Amino acid sequence: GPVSVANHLGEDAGHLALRRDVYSGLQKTPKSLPPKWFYDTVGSELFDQITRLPEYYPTRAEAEILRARSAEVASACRADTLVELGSGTSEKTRMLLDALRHRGSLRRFVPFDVDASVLSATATAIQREYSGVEINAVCGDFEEHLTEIPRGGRRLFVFLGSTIGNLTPGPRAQFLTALAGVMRPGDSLLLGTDLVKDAARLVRAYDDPGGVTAQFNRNVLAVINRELEADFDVDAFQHVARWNSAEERIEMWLRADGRQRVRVGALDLTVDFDAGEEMLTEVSCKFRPQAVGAELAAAGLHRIRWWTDEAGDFGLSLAAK
Ligand SMILES: O=C(O)[C@H](Cc1cnc[nH]1)n1cccc1
C-alpha cells in the first residue's frame, strides 16, 4: 500500500517551541518546564529503559490488557482506519493493527506525531509488514493540526500509556474537546489511563533504585544546555519523585543542591535557584474509573467499554462519538 507523509510543522517549529517554553517556565514561581522536552534521542533511549524496569508497571499493565482485549476492541469499534496520537513504533500499535487485519477490515493507518523523521521510518516499516494498508502519516501538533487527520471510513483514534496524564485537568479537557471535535459519529477513541493506587508504589515507579528515571529527569537540563547554550550544572540537581495527594498525581521535580545561577545564552536570560529550590518538570496524573468516563462525557464522547489489568493498576477506555 501507498505511503504519504504530510508535514505541517515549520522546519524550526521545535526550536522556537523550546525557546518559548524555557523562557516562560524558568521565570515562573516555581520554575516549571514541559515534559515533552525529555524526548530527544538520549532521552528516548532512557524512556525505553524505564518501560522495562521492575518498578515501572504501566507499560506492562497496558500491554496485558491489549494482549487480551484488542480483538474485542476491533469487534466493538469496527474500524478500517487506525489513527495513533503517537509515533507508531510500539508493539501495542501492532496489536491493534493485527486486530483490524484479523477482522478483515484494516484499510488505513494514520500516525500523528511531531518528528517527521520518526513518522517516515514508521510508515516504511508498517508498509512492509501490512500489504494493502494506506499509511497517511501526519506531522503536526494537537494545538492546531488535529484537523489535518484524513477524513472518511470508520476511525479509531488511539492515545495510550496515560500520555493524557501528562495534562493537568485544564489542558486535559481542552484536548479531549478538540479531539472529539474532529471525530465523526461512529468514530471511537481508545485511551489509556494509569489509576490511583498505593502512594508507596506510585513513588517507586518514578524513582527506580539505579536511577534510570533520575537520569531521564535531569536529561531535560542537557537538552537545554545544548539547544539553548545554557550552563546548568546538571550533576548539582537532584531527582525528586513527589506524590501530590490532593491533585492525586505524581510530580517530577529537580531539587537544586546549593544556590545555582544558570544563564541561557540563546534567550539572553539569567535565572536563579535558591539552595534546595525545586523545579517542576513533569506531572503524571493518576485517574479513577468513574472520573475518566465522566471526563470523556464532558468532551462529547460516551464510554462503551472499560478494561482493567488483572491487578487493577491501569485502565483502558473505549468511547464513541
Ligand atoms: O507518565 C509516565 O509514566 C511517562 C513519563 C515518565 C515515566 N517515568 C517518568 N516519567 N509517560 C507516559 C506517557 C507520557 C509520559
Author numbering: 1 to 321
What's written in the study?
Multiple X-ray crystal structures of Mycolicibacterium smegmatis EgtD show that EgtD possesses a Histidine binding domain and a Rossmann-fold domain, which affords ordered substrate binding of L-Histidine and AdoMet, respectively. In this work, library screening and structure-guided strategies identified multiple classes of M. tb EgtD inhibitors that bind in various regions of the enzyme active site.
The obtained crystals were subjected to X-ray diffraction experiments and X-ray crystal structures were obtained for M. tb EgtD with HD2, HD3, and HD6. HD2 forms primarily polar interactions with the histidine binding site residues of EgtD. Specifically, HD2 forms a hydrogen-bonded interaction between an ordered water molecule, positioned by the Thr213 side chain and the backbone carbonyl of Ala205, and the basic nitrogen atom of the imidazole moiety. As with L-Histidine in published EgtD structures, the carboxylic group in HD2 forms hydrogen-bonded interactions with Tyr206, Ser284, and Tyr56. This compound is commercially available as a racemic mixture of L- and D- HD2 enantiomers. Based on the interactions observed in the EgtD complex with L-Histidine, it is reasonable to expect the L-enantiomer to be the dominant ligand. In this case, the 2.7 Å resolution of the EgtD-HD2 complex X-ray crystal structure is not sufficient to unambiguously define the stereochemistry of the bound inhibitor. First, HD2, HD3, and HD6 most closely resemble a Histidine amino acid as they all possess α-amino and α-carboxyl moieties, but the α-amino group is elaborated with a variety of chemical linkages. As expected, these binding modes closely resemble that of L-Histidine with the minor exception of the α-carboxylate moiety of HD3.
